[PDB]
Amino acid sequence: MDIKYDVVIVGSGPIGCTYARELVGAGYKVAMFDIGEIDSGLKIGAHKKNTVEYQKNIDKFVNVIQGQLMSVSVPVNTLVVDTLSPTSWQASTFFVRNGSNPEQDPLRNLSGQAVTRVVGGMSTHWTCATPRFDREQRPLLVKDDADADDAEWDRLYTKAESYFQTGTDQFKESIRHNLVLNKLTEEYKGQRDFQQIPLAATRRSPTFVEWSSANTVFDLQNRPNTDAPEERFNLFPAVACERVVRNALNSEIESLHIHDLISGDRFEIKADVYVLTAGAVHNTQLLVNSGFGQLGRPNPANPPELLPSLGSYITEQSLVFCQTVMSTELIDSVKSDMTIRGTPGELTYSVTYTPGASTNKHPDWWNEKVKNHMMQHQEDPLPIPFEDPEPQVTTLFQPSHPWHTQIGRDAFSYGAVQQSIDSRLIVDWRFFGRTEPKEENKLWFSDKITDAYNMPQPTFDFRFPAGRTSKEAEDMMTDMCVMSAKIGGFLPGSLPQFMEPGLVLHLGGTHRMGFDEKEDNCCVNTDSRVFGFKNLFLGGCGNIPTAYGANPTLTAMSLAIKSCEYIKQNFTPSPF
Amino acid sequence: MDIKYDVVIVGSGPIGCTYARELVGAGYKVAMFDIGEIDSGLKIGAHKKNTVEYQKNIDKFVNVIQGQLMSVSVPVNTLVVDTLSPTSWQASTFFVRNGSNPEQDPLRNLSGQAVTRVVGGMSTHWTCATPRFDREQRPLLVKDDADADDAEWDRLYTKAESYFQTGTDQFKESIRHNLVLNKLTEEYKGQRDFQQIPLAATRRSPTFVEWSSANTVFDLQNRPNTDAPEERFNLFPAVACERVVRNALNSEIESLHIHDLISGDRFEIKADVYVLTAGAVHNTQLLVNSGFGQLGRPNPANPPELLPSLGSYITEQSLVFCQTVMSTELIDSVKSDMTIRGTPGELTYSVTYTPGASTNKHPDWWNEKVKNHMMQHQEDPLPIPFEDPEPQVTTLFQPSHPWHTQIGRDAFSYGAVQQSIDSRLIVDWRFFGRTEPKEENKLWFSDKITDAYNMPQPTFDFRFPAGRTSKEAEDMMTDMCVMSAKIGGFLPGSLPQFMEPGLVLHLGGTHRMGFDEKEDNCCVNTDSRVFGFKNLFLGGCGNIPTAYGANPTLTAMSLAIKSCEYIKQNFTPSPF
Amino acid sequence: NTVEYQKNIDKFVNVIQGQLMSVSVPVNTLVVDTLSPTSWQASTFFVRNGSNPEQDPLRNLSGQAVTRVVGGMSTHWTCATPRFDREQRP
Amino acid sequence: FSYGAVQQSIDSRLIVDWRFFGRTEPKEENKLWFSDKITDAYNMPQPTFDFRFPAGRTSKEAEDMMTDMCVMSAKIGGFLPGSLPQFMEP
Ligand SMILES: *Cc1cc2c(cc1C)Nc1c([nH]c(=O)[nH]c1=O)N2C[C@H](O)[C@H](O)[C@H](O)COP(=O)(O)OP(=O)(O)OC[C@H]1O[C@@H](n2cnc3c(N)ncnc32)[C@H](O)[C@@H]1O
Ligand SMILES: *Cc1cc2c(cc1C)Nc1c([nH]c(=O)[nH]c1=O)N2C[C@H](O)[C@H](O)[C@H](O)COP(=O)(O)OP(=O)(O)OC[C@H]1O[C@@H](n2cnc3c(N)ncnc32)[C@H](O)[C@@H]1O
Ligand SMILES: *Cc1cc2c(cc1C)Nc1c([nH]c(=O)[nH]c1=O)N2C[C@H](O)[C@H](O)[C@H](O)COP(=O)(O)OP(=O)(O)OC[C@H]1O[C@@H](n2cnc3c(N)ncnc32)[C@H](O)[C@@H]1O
Ligand SMILES: OC[C@H]1O[C@@H](O)[C@H](O)[C@@H](F)[C@@H]1O
Ligand SMILES: OC[C@H]1O[C@@H](O)[C@H](O)[C@@H](F)[C@@H]1O
């Protein structure tokens, strides 16, 4: 570890790796710090789902997710256990136990919100859905020129899509995918468009998908190295970043204070530029720990000196969920083009079809897979091949259906996985609603209570705003119930429900972007630069100030590409 | 990858790595293949619990375990779901579905048995308890001379313990550990002795333990390298070993058939010595796929050509579990030496002790920690410090209580982790019974059903033997009830129970060791060589032919060490 | 004492549960945070569904209950009638 | 008076219940009192408890009793999963 770098990035998720990729490639001496460790295989910060074992045992991956999602704010527990032995030590009060937060009102929380501390961040476990936001969900980069605004966003998105390797044909020859996609397309013909979820992923084989991650964006190997001899990069895992030091004039950051978790020692790191990409919650924590905003329960009677909007206007999406069991009619349609020569198991059994026949309801790639399945496996009563990938269908947010949708199978299952019903029959439904930014909705940090890293404990003051947010959320639920029924009935144990506020992990607006600090109620400008400070930048979903339904990561990445263009224009790399 | 090695080892668990450590050390050219991949970070095959984050959020680690335990044999599911929508597709039978094994009798299973496919094997997640077996539990390595047998075991264990870095001092200054240990010592005074569970681990810091693993035994780095420029070792991950090829006379192995899972390519690898350390289930799977023992449902009318005892006499331990909530008396005794005045939270409150007083119940370090906790956290009603490590207590197996005991906190929790009761109060109790080896208890492999790697599907025919094993399992239950009540009453949700057969993962005797193939009904000799074959060696818990209650891994290692002594005596390494 | 209850012994528990009314039920503080945003939800754990705001949940006899029928609890009891020995007896 | 769902996979002929009842020391501090403001379903003052099992002999005996039940019951059989040894609600 050196003492001085051109650039220092806090956090090694995909947004920090965006800044790494742009600035390391542009010749800056870059240091990156993460509080978590390299745990993930030889490809540093790669997707954990990319092993042969998780791709043969994809029901198990939920365990990896759960194992690295740690709850942000757990209210004091009031459950009554009144069947302890009389000899056992027993509480007189509901006192603060097990890491809980006494500042947290249980009824105004985002109880599902969680954070991940591993190199690569949450991109080590994510679903990889990278849709663009349309105008209605997206903040303005240009004022007073819609066409120019769209042009700027299209340029940033096309880059971001390239970094992530976003694509929309990786599931094109999945039977289950097309079964679902075709039925919904038909059902909403002239009303709604359905397509594959855009995915940051590259298919390698018919049974393997290489899912994208922070590693894809930047490979996180220290530099110079053989393949990049003139670049300069160091990653320092197990380093808790604690405070950015402000000059007295509140115009420049002078250092970053770090705590090495292995040695236990503390250090002051100097940079020309400081970039915080520690996620929506922890970027906010790090700033409040540094004198930005207001530490403690909000007190309107005392304006903070800096960033009064910090941690207000936070948004989290409502999420509805269910699973369906494929209708008999749809399953029968899978085998419609087949010729079935008699009784299964017995000599009188050929399964054939006519390639290219114009009476055929399905393509030839579909019939050949069904044929070979029905012939290699004549005990099995379903026409869906055993290896066939899950659907990945969406109809994107529009004004007449203002929610995002993901239809298929997500690795994050929410209950014990059922085993009685054949898995090929099961389709998940997740609808995601947008939340109006409101000043009263707040993430703040205690001035007494601390977390397991000794930083001020985060505390939420959150309710879904009345009015449109709440109206839409319920309309969204009914839409899921109506649409899902076209495919099949609900699976008992996965009936239509709202998920725990915040489980969806799409928290935005904790350090929101705008043109003007005061009139837009924001903390950073459209360069992601913190108002008043020359050399401090913030990256991630915390930047997004709008009400959005779709998954925010590609959009945060686009914003980070723009911020890097500013940094490149205003700071010069040190000589090599 | 070469065609030709001195030694090939199949499996990179800690037994594999014992063979590599000995043979790579002695100058042999070694290759190891593992079906799974590297994913413990830059330390290949290291313990996944060695992150600062896991050791701060101890509850979370069970997810990692559950993530990489895949059930060996799941019977066909016959759960009735009769609340499907009438439009959903439903079969009219309980057909073979979702990977289940139609060979498996649900009533004669080890349903909790499971395997792990990752470089470092189960040592990447284990508990690291490494006790010796006493004579009663241990196979003979020398007959008719008890002193020479004790001497050989002592030598081999001692060597095993240096490999794993086993110790009994890492929890010595935990208040909770000492509280439980002292009370148990006092209560059974001169009927039973208690001590710390011997653990393969080194404490780094008051709040961090470096848990040992395969990596501790052998770092798994390709050699030659700057640290070992004369050594020759290559690891090949993502390689499924499928068959060993026998010569016509069944006196030697001629090659190893493998399948590179990333590329799809198949190869036959040549070696002088072939070592199988694929685990108790998979070593057997591979032998049977190579024409040892018998494929398919056991048929005593058709004797096997080779190794007639392969897969019979299997043992797996009974396990009984509860948790307790610490007694008021025990908790009050934590502060026995303190003078407490005034009222918590007021400026008049104080807590003090008399250092060195010979009438103090506890040592100065105890009293200092309690004092600082009670003075700094006057809102907390417990005298135990917040990061006190957990208890790690055992009373080892003896003839008058012939079960192993582990008292404390295990990372493998079995239910939802409860939050109402302060974790500082909770003590886990696991007692492990020994199971008599019986011929009728079998692991066999289907001749038609294959597993997710297209190998013969494992199937169990198992029941705890009547007579001694059963009598002891139920006496062991009563023993856990009786001892645990000395410390406190049962935690609701964790009441005294037998765990699922095989959940404990101490399967033994699948390829058991003995002096004589016929008279001892076994598969390998005391050099772990397969009878008949000059150059084929098996390693692991599969070898242990006795009824044991203690954790087997250290014992299997000690056998691997002896095996390597035989290899050094009978094969010469190739010149560098 | 019906032929049906002594043929279906498992079912009589329902009769017992049906006439045991809880004596003191503390205010409920279970958190249900998966309601639709359009549903009415109050801001506190207010006194709801017949609960008793005087009751400390941690110093209760939560299982205690009463029966208001002619014959009282002798309409459902187990009928066990031991004598007390001296130690137990006033 | 069964306490949970009735299990149907184990033949009811095998199943034996165990209930052990401890004695509780009478203590002035254990009280049943009635609210001067809250009323029950029949317009009468709401009953409220302030109870804990007394430390000392009551509590020691109760734990000794739970242990005795684990010891005695094992002479007849192992525990039925779902009805493991437990204290019931006060
Ligand atoms: C967990 C989850 C998340 C997402 C999906 C599903 C699952 C189950 N699916 C997904 C999501 N995003 C979408 O756009 N599409 C989808 O299909 N998920 C969210 C996505 O995963 C995040 O939006 C994205 O990674 C966030 O990127 P980031 O801003 O770079 O933040 P990360 O949380 O990934 O990484 C931050 C990082 O910094 C570290 N850290 C935290 N505090 C410190 C301090 N104080 N010092 C140093 N380092 C710090 C963390 O350790 C972490 O790596
Ligand atoms: C999972 C677990 C295990 C243990 C404890 C707790 C938990 C939850 N605690 C524990 C253990 N044992 C102890 O003595 N002490 C305790 O405190 N656990 C058991 C222990 O972990 C095992 O006994 C030990 O690893 C076995 O060592 P091994 O014989 O080297 O076998 P592994 O299963 O670790 O590794 C074998 C290995 O080979 C691979 N494989 C499997 N099949 C193939 C084929 N066909 N080709 C190539 N490679 C193969 C695996 O992927 C694996 O790595
Ligand atoms: C419910 C139950 C009870 C017993 C056991 C099993 C179960 C599930 N088994 C048991 C019993 N006791 C035995 O010694 N051995 C066993 O094997 N149980 C308890 C027993 O049932 C009670 O001890 C007994 O009936 C008490 O008799 P009681 O003192 O006569 O009181 P009851 O509660 O039976 O009847 C009182 C009664 O008067 C009424 N009432 C209440 N308030 C008013 C007012 N304000 N005005 C007029 N009447 C009032 C009730 O309606 C009731 O009928
Ligand atoms: O809860 C899982 C969901 O998590 C969200 O964070 C993702 O963006 C979705 F893709 C995913 O379906
Ligand atoms: O199931 C957990 C148990 O697993 C067994 O494999 C271990 O040996 C114990 F150490 C551990 O407590």
Author numbering:
A (entry chain A), B (entry chain B): 43 to 618
C (entry chain D): 92 to 181
D (entry chain D): 454 to 543
The authors write:
With the aim to identify TmP2O variants with improved turnover of Gal and a more equal conversion of Glc and Gal, results from saturation mutagenesis returned the TmP2O variant H450G as having increased Gal conversion rates with O2 as electron acceptor compared with the wild type, while retaining acceptable Glc conversion, giving a lower Glc-to-Gal selectivity. His450 is located immediately before the start of the highly dynamic substrate-recognition loop in TmP2O (residues 451–461), but is itself not part of the conformationally more dynamic region of the active site. In the H450G–3FGlc complex (mimic of the productive binding mode for Glc), the mutation is accompanied by only minor structural changes in the overall active site, including mainly relaxation of the backbone at position 450. Compared with H167A and V546C, which retain His450, the backbone at position 450 in H450G is relaxed by the His450→Gly replacement, beyond which only minor structural changes in the overall active site accompany the mutation. His450 is close to both Asp452 and Arg472 (important determinants of regioselective 2-oxidation of Glc) when the active-site loop is in the productive semi-open conformation. The corresponding selectivity ratio for H450G is 9 in favor of Glc, meaning that if to achieve a more equal conversion efficiency of the two substrates, the relative preference for Glc over Gal is more favorable for H450G. Thus, all else being equal, the H450G mutant is the preferred variant for achieving a more balanced yield of products from Glc and Gal oxidation.
